[model samples]
Target: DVETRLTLAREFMSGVDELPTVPDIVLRIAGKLNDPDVAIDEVADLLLQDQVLTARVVHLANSPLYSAARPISSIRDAVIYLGLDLLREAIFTCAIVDLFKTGKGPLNRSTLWAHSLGVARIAKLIAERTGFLNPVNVYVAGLLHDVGEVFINFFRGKEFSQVVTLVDEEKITFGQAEERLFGTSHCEVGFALAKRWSLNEFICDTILYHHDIEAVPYKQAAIVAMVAFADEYCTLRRLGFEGHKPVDSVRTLLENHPSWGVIRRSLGGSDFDEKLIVAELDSSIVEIRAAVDELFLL
Candidate 1:
């Protein structure tokens, strides 16, 4: 019965023609970006072809997080500033702004966007503070980490509602709820989508293993570890699904969490400023709204 339900879920996702296909522009840009010899003008031309995308890309390049002394105005300038990898992530970010557009479910778009932005900001900060090079890379992973929640709401509908109910009413984790109902879970669904869309293997692994810390493989390694901790960190800060727990309560929980050591050791354990993390995240609310609104309907 479990196997049959899993098959049905997989087929439902696979057979649906309309479920959020990666925008063609993203695929096109990604293809050109793969060639080491690709020209900056070539990439700029492709991006400029999509007016809305150009605006988003330029907007992202100008965000407070990435902006410099001069404002970025042109597609070529945006490409130059973001580099290939960061630009690639930005393209996907711009494209997927429409992921929740078609769904008619009770998924809280604004709240979900808020949660995603919260994780993105905090995770990036954690990575930077801990000396995990490529903070933007971790930001991309954090921003899309819970994309499985969108997948769950899109395809599973009533069953997903039950999963939420189980979390709220039964005090279980989201994964437990999914396993109780779907046999598999949103991680798997998101993983399937990420693989289908040809997201970087590391990003795919982040989506798949964000909730399962012990399962993160060597390839993804510390980033996945940091993301898992970041997800929980946001959850404790009232940004994610398990609802808010007090900082003291959270610190207690983190003390025993298997992934806590990775985050603690990475950031100098006791020397890491817990107060500053909370303060910074608090200060980032406005920034989060701007970031999410840049990439989503919210």
Candidate 2:
């Protein structure tokens, strides 16, 4: 059955108009960042070649997500504040989101983008508070975790529409609906894309098993769990990304965990501040719109 679904996913990806090709700039910059002697100024100048991307990066720097002590008004300032790795990851997230700016049929890309930004921002916060070492990668994971939904809509539009209808009428989760109707879920589909793109294994694992009750056992399980919980928080609040309504599974998983007493107390506790997160979403609406508008101009 898993083999069948994987075949279906591969067929769809191969047959589609495009698989949302990653930009050469992303690959080039990411590769250079891996080197010990890469210069920040050179990267900043390289980014200037794409005006829309530069603007969006600066815009993100000014967002409350950054909370920079001083205004980051230029490309160099954003590069300096975000650093190369975080900046690279952020641009990758931005570029991918831009590719899906016009989601299929009834799927609203703006809403999806906003929801992604929320999860990403919250994931970074959780990582920082929980002492997760690679916060930006976690942020990228949060942003793109639901990307398979976009691919599903693109490749299997008819079936996914039925899947959405099942969600609405039966009040079942998306994954459950997908399993009943199509025999597989977005988690697997997303993993297909991650593997195809040759992203890191941590990303592949998160994309593949972020929803599982028995999460794919790995070093980053806690971080993946945090991403899933943050996703549930956004879904429950109706802040953004209303496409995947797998809240019950996540709630049950978090509540049943052995160490959840500490986790729930720390993350979902009184200090978690849902109001502030919602406010951040509200403030981000205009910028998301601006970024979408600018993306098309590129």
Candidate 3:
């Protein structure tokens, strides 16, 4: 207790460089992202590092779902068309998946990838349902919600496998198992990774706060609220679950956040429309799943 909380925070926060370490193509992407005057010429140069990822990104841009106004043939063109945000998210998601797509978990590589996509779609839906600022980003945020587990698993394969086994056999959620083993869970790892990557403040907040209201207040907690809603809706439908019950704490937080004020009282179950969420997922999941499928082993 002698060292101040500030001192402890400094210790944890300084590991930013190590947390979201830039892989090969990502380093190229980072060079572009960190520069405001990012050029298309530089983009192609960066992308050429990984032929597989380049093909995937270009192919995805051509899909009816994401095809832009212009015919895109190369990374530079795709950059000017998709802009930095989507480009960054698409590239980052792909790079992360390629880097951490395998483990000794109960589910094999393919099943794990599919489940990750479902989680991401549900997350995107959560953002849309809440009238959020960037539903797309929320969806991306949700998609990678469990990246932390995989990242940790790379270091502690046996321990992580045991947690997964416990969740399946005991019907316990991933978060609860994480708490029992590591003293924290994906939310904490999400927060750490987000800060490390220097992702937008709101998205990072959602990653960190999605699990517990008490740990993080309403900062990016709106994200937490939305994703939690998506997870529950998905679980209730028997879509897929790593194991965890729906936490009503998010709705309660929306009810309690000082900013909600007048709106909170007026908003109700009708406003949230749990049923419409299923329908929205119905529409989005097909495309989302396709995106996820293409992502694996790339």
The alpha-carbon RMSD values of the candidates against the true structure, listed in the order shown, are 4.5, 5.6, 6.4
Indicate which candidate wins on lDDT.
1
TM-score of each candidate structure, all chains considered together: 0.75, 0.75, 0.66
Report the C-alpha lDDT of model 2 over 196-287, residue by residue, as the tens digit: 87776666666776665254554326557667766765665564543454445644443454333333443443244334444554555466
Q: How close is candidate 2 to the true structure, as a TM-score?
A: 0.75
Error of 2 at 76 (Å): 2.3
lDDT by residue for model 1 (1-298), tens? 4345446547657655666666776556544444556566655666756888779878877776666666788767778787765676667666656665556445676666667766776777777766765676787778778777787777666667888787888787877777777677777777777778888877778888887678654533666777877788777756677443335565556546656455554445334554565566566756654665564455
Q: lDDT at 34 for candidate 2?
A: 42
C-alpha lDDT (0 to 100) for residue 49 of candidate 1: 61
* Candidate 1: 10-residue stretch with minimal lDDT: 265-274
Q: Which whole-number lDDT from 0 to 100 does residue 179 have in model 1?
A: 74
